[PDB]
Design a protein around this ligand. Structure first.
Ligand SMILES: NCc1ccc(CNC(=O)[C@@H]2Cc3ccc(cc3)NC(=O)CCN3CCN(CCC(=O)Nc4ccc(cc4)C[C@@H](NS(=O)(=O)c4ccccc4)C(=O)N2)CC3)cc1
Length: 241
C-alpha cells in the first residue's frame, strides 16, 4: 500500500512547525553520507526520491546510505532500517530531482511505508495545505534532532512568480509553498525531502524540497520540484532498472 500511515499524523498546535507524531510520516528517509545531510521519500520498497543537489558531492552510490523508520536523527531507535544505495539516477534535464535505488528492498512495517505518487501533470491547487517534513535547520525554533513537520499552503506559480515573491524564478516543473508572513518553513537539511498532500484518504508526494530565498522569510515561499511532472520518468526508470 502507499500513502497510508499506520500511525496517524497530527497537525501542529524545519524552521517553526512542530515535532511530528513519531512514525506518522513513514516514507520519510534520512540520506546520509553517518551524518544526516538530506531528506528523501520512499516511493517503493526499493526506490527513494530525493533532490539531485543532495548528490552533487558524489556520483558514487556507495557514498550514500538511507535511514528508514526513524524519528530521532542521532540515537537511531532500534527497528530503524539502514540500507545502502546501489544506483543513482539524476533527472536527465538537469532538474533538481533524483532516484536512489536501494541495495535491498526496505521492509514494509508500521513505521516504514511508501508515499504515493501523483498522476502525471497534476497541479496542486492554490492554497492547498500540504505537509513538509524533515530533520533540517530549525533557526531557533525548537525540535532539533527530532523529525519535524510543517503544514504549508501551496502558492500557485503565477502568484509565486510575481515580483513581490519570487520574481520569475519558478519553473512550471516546480511548485511553491509557504506561509508568506514567515516563520515556518523547510530549510537546509530538509532538501530532498517530501512535500505531501492528503487526497481522499492518503498522502501523495507532490513535491521534493529543493530551494528557497532563505528559509521562513516573509514573502519567500519555498520551492519544490513538482513531482507530477516527473512521474513518467520515474516510472520508466523503475521499470527499466
Ligand atoms: N524552504 C526553503 C528551503 C528549503 C530547503 C533548502 C535546501 N536547499 C538549498 O540550499 C539549495 C540547494 C540548490 C538547489 C537547487 C539548485 C542549486 C542549489 N538548482 C540548480 O543549481 C539548477 C540551476 N538553476 C539554478 C537557478 N535557477 C533559477 C532560479 C534560482 O535562482 N534558484 C535558486 C536560488 C538560490 C539558490 C538555489 C537556487 C541557493 C540557495 N538559496 S539561498 O537563498 O542562498 C539559501 C540560504 C540559506 C538557506 C536557504 C537558502 C538554495 O536554496 N540552495 C535555475 C536553475 C533551502 C531552502
Amino acid at each position: 500500500d502507499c500513502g497510508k500511515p499506520q500511525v496517524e499524523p497530527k497537525k501542529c498546535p524545519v524552521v517553526g512547525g512542530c515535532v511530528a507524531h513519531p512514525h506518522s510520516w513513514p516514507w520519510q528517509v534520512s540520506l546520509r553520507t553517518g551524518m544526516h545531510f538530506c531528506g528523501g521519500t520512499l516511493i517503493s520498497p526499493e526506490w527513494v526520491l530525493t533532490a539531485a543537489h543532495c548528490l552533487e558531492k558524489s556520483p558514487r552510490p556507495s557514498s550514500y546510505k538511507v535511514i528508514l523508520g526513524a524519528h530521532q536523527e542521532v540515537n537511531l531507535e532500534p527497528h530503524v532500517q539502514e540500507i545502502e544505495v546501489s544506483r543513482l539516477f539524476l533527472e536527465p534535464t538537469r532538474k533538481d530531482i533524483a532516484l536512489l535505488k536501494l541495495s535491498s528492498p526496505a521492509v514494509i512495517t508500521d513505521k516504514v511505508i511508501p508515499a504515493c505518487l501523483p498522476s502525471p501533470n497534476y497541479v496542486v491547487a492554490d492554497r492547498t495545505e500540504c505537509f513538509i517534513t524533515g530533520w533540517g535547520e530549525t533557526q531557533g525554533t525548537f525540535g532539533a534532532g527530532l523529525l519535524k513537520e510543517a503544514q504549508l499552503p501551496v502558492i500557485e506559480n503565477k502568484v509565486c512568480n510575481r515580483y513581490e515573491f519570487l520574481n520569475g524564478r519558478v519553473q512550471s516543473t516546480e511548485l511553491c509553498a509557504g506561509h508568506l508572513a514567515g516563520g515556518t518553513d523547510s530549510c537546509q537539511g530538509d532538501a530532498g525531502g517530501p512535500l505531501v498532500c492528503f487526497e481522499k484518504d492518503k498522502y501523495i508526494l507532490q513535491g521534493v524540497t529543493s530551494w528557497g530565498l532563505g528559509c521562513a522569510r516573509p514573502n519567500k515561499p519555498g520551492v519544490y520540484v513538482r513531482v507530477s511532472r516527473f512521474v513518467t520518468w520515474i516510472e520508466g526508470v523503475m521499470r527499466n532498472n
